[PDB]
Write a structure and sequence with these properties.
This is FERM and PDZ domain-containing protein 4. Positive regulator of dendritic spine morphogenesis and density. Required for the maintenance of excitatory synaptic transmission. Binds phosphatidylinositol 4,5-bisphosphate. It comes from Homo sapiens (Human). The protein is an alpha+beta fold. Among the domains are: about 100-220, Acyl-CoA Binding Protein; about 225-320, PH-domain like. It has 10 helices and 13 strands. The protein has helices spanning about 30-40, 75, 100-105, 105-120, 130-150, 160-165, 175-180, 180-200, 205-220, 305-320; strands at about 5, 10-15, 20-25, 50-55, 65-70, 85-90, 225-235, 240-245, 250-255, 260-265, 270-275, 285-290, 295-300. The strands form 2 sheets. Strands 10-9-8-7-13-12-11 form a 7-stranded antiparallel beta sheet. Strands 1, 2, 3, 4, 5 and 6 form a 6-stranded mixed beta sheet that branches. It starts with a strand and ends in an 11-residue tail after the last helix.
């Protein structure tokens, strides 16, 4: 079996709505090429927000996403380690700081962001920072949004949701394993009704306006458009293990203490002038961050983490700082 290909030289790409798409490649096709073909198929204007990623299945349950560079060749992608048992996903990797800005810009991309976020929320792709409290509240809106776009009833019925979709589809595994089904349904019952109580003075919440609310809750969070990396900081040729957080509100920052959400800026995206990677022992990659008014910062990282750091940093630079200028170029 092979999760990455349909066949020799035909790439399988999963969209966030469950669709699959195929791309014939030869030895010259780049990830950039497939992204442009997907921009055209899907009528996207904000392609700068999007990336192709590999889905790694880790030993314990849960997936790790490996960002792929545009200049990277598809053949070069099938040679990553155990490419055959990973999947290719098209996803928004560089989120706008306020979701509403995407909606006025590319509605297709905004709808794409809402569908991807729902999947992210239910599959616990945010940390435990997503408390069951928020998770149920998010579910009540996802549930609302699924109903108003399928039935005229503006009043939401768990019994419908139970049959048509399955309640479990809107809930994380943790609520499923920890909360009592009766307790979950009571919780949703009070929630949906209370939000229903918030709306009567107002005209009914449109699905689109509900989706805006769904993504605003998500936008105030740590792993929103962001990732956590282990890395080895080399400072005066001696080594220490660091945890980096790269995201839209953190530039490249370092986690000092999770308990107090203590994060330290190492570099705003605007202060990054270049990223360079080299090779070391046993798929260990040395990253050198060239930052304004400081000596370069040196990181020793596992190769796929090294690449997801460059991509995510270059991705947010292209988005938030300058669309033309390059910071990272593989060769």
């Amino acid at each position: 079996d092979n999760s990455l290909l349909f066949m020799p030289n035909v790439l399988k790409v999963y969209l966030e709505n469950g669709q699959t798409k195929s791309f014939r490649f030869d030895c010259s096709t780049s990830i950039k090429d497939v992204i442009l073909t997907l921009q055209e198929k899907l009528s996207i204007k904000g392609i700068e927000h999007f990336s192709l990623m590999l889905e790694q299945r880790t030993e314990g349950a849960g997936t790790k996403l490996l960002l792929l560079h545009e200049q990277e060749t598809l053949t070069q992608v099938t040679q990553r380690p155990s490419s055959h048992k990973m999947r290719c996903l098209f996803r928004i990797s560089f989120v706008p700081k306020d979701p509403i800005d995407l909606l006025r810009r590319d509605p297709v991309a905004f709808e794409y962001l809402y569908v991807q976020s729902c999947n992210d929320v239910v599959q616990e792709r945010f940390g435990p920072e997503l408390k069951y409290d928020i998770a149920l509240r998010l579910a009540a809106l996802q549930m609302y949004i699924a109903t108003v776009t399928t039935k005229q009833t503006q009043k939401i019925s768990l019994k419908y949701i139970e049959k048509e979709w399955g309640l479990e589809t809107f809930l994380p595994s943790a609520v499923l394993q920890s909360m009592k089904e009766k307790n979950i349904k009571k919780a949703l019952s009070h929630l949906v009704k209370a939000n229903q109580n918030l709306v009567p003075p107002g005209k009914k919440l449109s699905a689109l306006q509900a989706k805006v609310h769904y993504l605003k809750f998500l936008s105030d969070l740590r792993l929103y458009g962001g990732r956590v990396f282990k890395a080895t900081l080399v400072q005066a040729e001696k080594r220490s293990e660091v945890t980096l957080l790269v995201g839209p509100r953190y530039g490249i920052s370092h986690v000092i203490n999770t308990k107090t959400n203590l994060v330290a800026l190492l570099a705003d995206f605007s202060h990054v002038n270049r990223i360079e990677m080299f090779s070391e022992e046993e798929s260990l990659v040395r990253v050198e961050l060239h930052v304004l008014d400081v000596k370069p910062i040196t990181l020793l990282m596992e190769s796929s983490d090294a690449m997801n750091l460059a991509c995510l940093t270059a991705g947010y630079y292209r988005l938030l700082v300058d669309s033309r200028r390059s910071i990272f170029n593989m060769a």
